[model samples]
Target: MRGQRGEVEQMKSCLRVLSQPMPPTAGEAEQAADQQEREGALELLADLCENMDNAADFCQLSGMHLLVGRYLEAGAAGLRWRAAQLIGTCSQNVAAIQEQVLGLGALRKLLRLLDRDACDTVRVKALFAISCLVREQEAGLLQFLRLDGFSVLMRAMQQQVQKLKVKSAFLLQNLLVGHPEHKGTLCSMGMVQQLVALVRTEHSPFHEHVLGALCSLVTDFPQGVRECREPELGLEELLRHRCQLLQQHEEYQEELEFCEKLLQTCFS
Candidate 1:
């Protein structure tokens, strides 16, 4: 009986130890030591980035790697954000959080992800990063346009018209600000009618953005805006109505506000 009792107590002690969190795997311990060996910091984040199964660990280690000037490691962090965007499991807020501090290289890298990535979330962020470029008048918007990116963006907008879709409108606004030549194509493509259809749907939460884009589309391409002709005088009536709002309407005060701002900042 004493021997059996002793065995039970020993078994209990073994269970207690097993219940505790397991120690770091040998690979993890070696990684720590390797980090120390290279000037006591992570010397090659590219190598570490490949072992990213644990999200929390990946974020933590990536942050540390970036802090230590391990750009390849920082790039790995960007890949995580990119992957999350692809899987439809990431946040758009990440772009706002990372832009200025990420420097031009990181910023460019993120934009490349948006341009080439298969995920809408990443593309949404790429669109935001593009907005940041809108503040630059000379080359930013044009550079993105030359990529032939508008078609991809328009297709994405047709799929979902909430925040990401609204980005397409904003980008068009910015594009027309500096590059007037594209106004013909944008209008010829029936872009203005497509934007107005969103307002009629009313399912879209970004009514203001869509309406603003439509107003600008008409203002920028009055000739192309005429292309939206209706045999029953429908297009003319709608255009007249929108013009009236620009002239006087309390509910559409916000659209006028943007008009003044765009004229002052982008045109005038």
Candidate 2:
């Protein structure tokens, strides 16, 4: 299950099977298939989720992923657990779903799950789901963020910080950069200070991850960028140090690449 090739092959097979349905015209076919298969799929996934002993079953992971991708295509609404489980499965199979034109309905359910659910596993999947959906459909992201989705996720993140997982803060940070409202929401959540502190720490475990998010976020405004790079409210010195580190690190090279792409989007 953890092997790269095994995951990719399973994903390819699932996509091939799920894509077998007719090309959607503009009605309920997309949504219906998801709702119909959801219950049975949930039963299977819930079993896998309950027992860590079953965690290595790639077939189970891939099968649940097909249902999830189908549901994403179908655009059905689901309970938090269902949404969370699907997201969690996809986090395991992110590359499979990341490039698809994800259904906004499923995306919203995932966000709502992240916003309100008490389960950490679900929250982690919600983050991965958002990252997959947004990266595939970056153009429509701002409108999505305006729904106060960022606030919900960020608040959840603040609550979940102590139990850092694979993709929680990283995912929120990724979404934060693509849309202005997301950035504003993060600021409103008082995350800028925490983010600065996290990135500036000398050997924080998630330092590079948070730094990437800060880099993407500050690209839009000088003040915000400076606040992160040269924070004014008791953290500027720390930010300054992080900035110096950024200059010397090659890991931030992608941040520069993305910044150039963003500038080109505006001008060209």
Candidate that scores best on lDDT: 2
Q: Quote the positional error of residue 155 for candidate 1 in Å.
A: 3.0
Q: Kindly list the per-residue Cα lDDT of model 2 for residues 1-268, writing each as its tens digit.
A: 4435654454445345444654446467755665445544454544443433233443344544454545433333353455455555543434334333244245565666667556665566566656655653554365356556656654654463544432566666556554555565565556667765554344444555565666555666554554444325454444444445556567665544433433343223
Per-model CA lDDT versus the true structure: 0.46, 0.51
TM-scores for all candidates: the values are: 0.46, 0.48
Candidate 1 C-alpha lDDT tens digits along 1-268: 2123443344334323323332356576765443333321221222232333221232332342243233222223343343323212111233322332233333444455555665555567556645554334334445545554565556556655366767766666556665676667777766766765654554333556665665565564655446544343344444344546566667767765654543443333
How many backbone overlaps does candidate 2 show? 2
